[PDB]
């Protein structure tokens, strides 16, 4: 129930010209904040 890993859907779930779908921009922000947290620990 507690998510330590997350699937990202196939590209046909979220087509390249909506340009990118809102799911794709949320997944960018998750990846960015994962880099922010990892750096601030160091």
């Amino acid at each position: 129930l507690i998510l330590t890993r997350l699937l990202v859907p196939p590209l046909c779930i979220r087509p390249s010209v909506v340009n990118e779908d809102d799911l794709t921009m949320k997944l960018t922000e998750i990846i960015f904040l994962n880099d922010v947290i990892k750096k601030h620990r160091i």
Binding site: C12, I13, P15, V17
Partner: protein, 49 residues
């Protein structure tokens, strides 16, 4: 008015009301509304018309 039938040539029994009434043509025309699809283009996300 006393009106004669154009089909049979015999007169009509009832008198028919005759006059000029203003009539306005509306923008809704069947040529701009007839539509048919056999098969055709589809959406990218859901592969339905």
């Amino acid at each position: 008015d006393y009106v004669t039938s154009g089909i049979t040539g015999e007169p009509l029994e009832a008198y028919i009301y005759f006059g000029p009434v203003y009539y306005q043509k509306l923008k809704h025309m069947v040529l701009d509304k007839m539509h048919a699809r056999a098969r055709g283009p589809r959406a990218v996300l859901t592969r339905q018309p």
